[PDB]
């Protein structure tokens, strides 16, 4: 991988592995999500930020501040097949004092066609107290020189799926998968549950018939609270709808504390 | 990746990814195991066998026969760090009618030093009845031209760790992790639980203090029965001692054994 000519974005190629594909012999959305975080990590390494998933500056480290994902939105047109080369371009943009946005474009290396796109909203949080705060000028200015000055959006559409408010699923859910627990492979280098694990937990409650007859086209996931290594999660899904649409909710098995909410859109195969 | 000059082994390089490392900032043994199966799959693709994890011939496909892992033995001296390039060489060898063996050597691309090694025993099974049928001459002859004729072993030492019989853990276990279930990411393209998932389930019952103060050096795992998508597993561990542990994976309900293994850990 490498930064592009203008140094304002980063590109990297990946060959899809045998264990990275599902029943369709194409990459799963969880493999895609892991590749997005990987290209994001290499972009931060290439410009001098931390490479632990938080992409911090020395000033942020002194204040015990980190970047945390608030929303992840992914839209896939064609999942790359086993052995195919996928090229991913990523860039960041400040959204004022609210937070920052990281965008991605996925392309088929051979045809040059756009096969997918993603966007993510990130907020600054103190690592210890878990309290959010609006981005300071001192921190904001350190990042501006690595972002495009003019707006560059993976999702430019006037009223697009990445900015819709997600409602809260009401009991009883139509479908559920109960008692989901992370194992050591779900933890990152910082011993926190990997963001991609929550995507897998959301999809655990989609019925098998949908997985067999449809392809996942869009997923939007909000991150409200973190699942600890010793927490147990319940995954809830209800149909909201040719195309099928679902409302999702992840909550702690015990008290019902919300950790995530999302929506998925599936198209008939 | 590519077959070597003599066409009797396959080599491939990998750059260790950020999500592939643990708290030591080096590749986990599960990332290593996935890279071993990946290089194994590319070796079969390069010579015309199936690329679904079973490495079958057209004759085996007509008879509904597949290769299944009976034993996996891995020894790591240095886990590759995030961003490092690891090179893996793999080869196969027939062990008569019993089955076949796949071996691997892991090297640091920059120093050329051997950082790990692995060996695995595979048996032929009818995919429908689950009955082991032992290798026929017709099938054996199809594979021989892709293997070295002289013995080439990743573990040559006479009577080494890869060939020791593993005993059955007796209740009560010293440690346990109960109610482990596979999710869709643990399934392969054939909707079967990936062999690497069982390695993770075995390690789930190692106490946190051991993980914090020791490094995993050796793991030997026997595969007796597979966990179905709707099965629930219990992971049991007892100290047998460096630290050494005896392991057992069994179905949560009736206690049917699916795997047994041993691990050896060295102080950091
Ligand atoms: C878990 C899961 C992952 C996927 N990746 C692409 N389509 C998918 C469908 C499901 C159900
Ligand atoms: C956190 C962050 C990391 C980055 N890496 C490259 N541009 C970036 C911009 C931001 C805001
Ligand atoms: C799960 C696990 C995976 C590892 N990989 C290397 N050391 C390890 C230790 C544990 C506990
Ligand atoms: C199954 C099998 C697959 C192989 N791929 C390359 N050599 C091989 C030898 C065997 C036995």
Swiss-Prot record, chain A:
CC annotations in GO: chloroplast
Enzyme type, top EC level: hydrolase
Residues at the active site: 190, 192, 227
Main location: plastid
GO biological process: fatty acid biosynthetic process
Catalytic activity, as annotated: (9Z)-octadecenoyl-[ACP] + H2O = (9Z)-octadecenoate + holo-[ACP] + H(+)
GO molecular function terms noted in the UniProt entry: fatty acyl-[ACP] hydrolase activity
The keyword Chloroplast is annotated on this UniProt entry: yes
Keywords: Chloroplast, Fatty acid biosynthesis, Fatty acid metabolism, Hydrolase, Lipid biosynthesis, Lipid metabolism, Plastid, Transit peptide
EC number: 3.1.2.14
UniProt family annotation: Belongs to the acyl-ACP thioesterase family.
Protein name according to UniProt: Oleoyl-acyl carrier protein thioesterase 1, chloroplastic
Species, as recorded: Arabidopsis thaliana (Mouse-ear cress)
Full-protein positions shown: 75 to 359 of 362
